[PDB]
Structure formats: structure tokens, C-alpha cells
A paper describes a structure:
The translational activator of cytochrome oxidase subunit I (TACO1) was identified when a single-base-pair insertion at position 472 (472insC) was found in patients with late-onset Leigh syndrome (LS) and cytochrome c oxidase deficiency. TACO1 and its bacterial homologues belong to the domain of unknown function 28 (DUF28) family of proteins that share structural similarity, but their roles in cells are not known. We show that TACO1 is required for COXI translation, binds the mt-Co1 mRNA specifically and this interaction is required for association with the mitochondrial ribosome. Here we discover that TACO1 is an RNA-binding protein that binds to multiple adenine-guanine-rich sequences within the mt-Co1 mRNA.
Author numbering: 74 to 294
Write the structure that this text describes.
């Protein structure tokens, strides 16, 4: 799909800015390229994204408010910050939201280590034990989650800086880290009703449809 390919181009460009255009030296870029190939993105399109100048485009993070007092984080890569800012504000405003003024940083980038509910010794890890190990590893928060199977899991949240150390300590303490990742976490969440939920989805969809948007984050529970 052409919209998918446009987003995947933005992701290639952002990965080249962070680690260079050689996927042998940039594992994040290598993962994106694999996904591109899995979606049947033509080589010509991949190469054009790969060979775009590292200095082209501005990476942008805009905060806004949606329907029911929700909070939004709009992640974008644009050739014109002013057009992108005006356009995102227009999309927010036309769908009942608003652009947050100033330096409201309602979302924080955080590290996230996912780990299974079983020790190296294949013994159960209950929440109380996950919490004690989180203290010892320097994790800021622990969430109980489920994957698509489904099956139980633990999400250990930390300072984005410390992602490296925490995964390592969790492994040294006997836990089984499945995956590492960066996520944008809001300070608090809101609950929306049905009329507000459908509106929020409409606004989010409109923002995802904008050409420069990579991702939209929200605090809707």
C-alpha cells in the first residue's frame, strides 16, 4: 500500500539520521528495510529513501489535546516545520482538538524491557518478585501485560538513558528479557465514553493520514 510505503520512507530517513545509511552498521535501519521488503516496497523507493541527505527534513514532536481532554503526541518528519505546525493545528482544530501551546511535555520517552513470567530456572515470577527485581535493576515501573497469543508478560519501564543497564541487570538477576524498545509514556491517562472515543479515533486517523506524520501517541484508556 502506498500510504504504508510513504510512512516506511519516513522511518528509513529517520533511521539514517540516527545511525547512517549502512544497515550493517545500523541494526534499526536493517530491521526497517526487512519490513519494507516484507511489504513488497520497490527497491527504487527504498534506495531513494536511503540516499536522501541526512540533513533534509526536521524531526518534530507536537503535543495537542483531543476530544475528551485527551492528550496527544504527534511525531513527524517534515521539509517545512511551519507548514507542518500549521497543518497539524488545522487538523486538530477541525476535529475538535487543539494544539498545546508552549513546552507542555505531557509525554516522556521511556525505555521498556519486556520479560516472561518464568525464571532461567523455569520457575514462576509473580508480581511481588518482579517488583523487587525492578527496584534492584533500577526500573521506574512494572506493568503486567499480555501478548497476541495470548500469554502473560512483564513490562519493566525505565529511564530512556538506562535502557542498556536495565536489560543487563534483569538478565543477571535471572529474568528472561524478550524485547527492548523505546516508548512515549503519558503522565496520566483519561477514560473516554463511546461518542468521545469515536471522535478521538477520527482525529487520530486524520493525523495519521497527514503526509509528514510517522506516529500519533495518545493517553486514552
Amino acid at each position: 500500500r502506498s500510504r504504508i510505503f510513504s510512512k516506511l520512507t519516513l522511518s528509513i530517513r529517520l533511521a539514517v539520521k540516527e545511525g547512517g545509511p549502512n544497515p550493517e552498521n545500523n541494526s534499526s535501519l536493517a530491521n526497517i528495510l526487512e519490513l519494507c521488503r516484507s511489504k513488497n516496497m520497490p527497491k527504487s523507493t527504498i534506495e531513494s529513501a536511503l540516499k536522501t541527505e541526512k540533513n533534509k527534513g526536521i524531526y518534530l514532536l507536537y503535543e495537542g489535546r483531543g476530544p475528551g481532554g485527551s492528550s496527544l503526541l504527534i511525531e513527524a518528519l517534515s521539509n517545512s516545520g511551519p507548514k507542518c505546525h500549521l497543518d497539524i493545528k488545522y487538523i486538530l482544530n477541525k476535529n475538535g482538538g487543539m494544539m498545546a501551546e508552549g513546552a507542555r511535555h505531557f509525554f516522556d520517552k521511556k525505555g521498556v524491557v519486556v520479560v516472561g513470567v518464568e525464571d532461567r530456572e523455569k520457575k514462576a515470577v509473580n508480581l511481588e518478585r518482579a517488583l523487587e527485581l525492578a527496584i534492584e535493576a533500577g526500573a521506574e515501573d512494572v506493568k503486567e501485560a499480555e501478548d497476541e497469543e495470548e500469554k502473560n508478560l512483564f513490562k519493566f519501564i525505565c529511564d530512556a538513558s538506562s535502557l542498556h543497564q536495565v536489560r543487563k541487570k534483569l538478565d543477571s538477576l535471572g529474568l528472561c528479557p524478550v524485547s527492548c524498545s523505546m516508548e512515549f509514556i503519558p503522565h496520566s491517562k483519561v477514560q473516554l465514553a463511546e461518542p468521545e472515543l469515536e471522535q478521538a479515533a477520527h482525529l487520530i486517523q486524520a493525523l495519521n493520514n497527514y503526509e509528514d506524520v510517522i506516529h500519533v501517541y495518545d493517553n486514552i484508556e
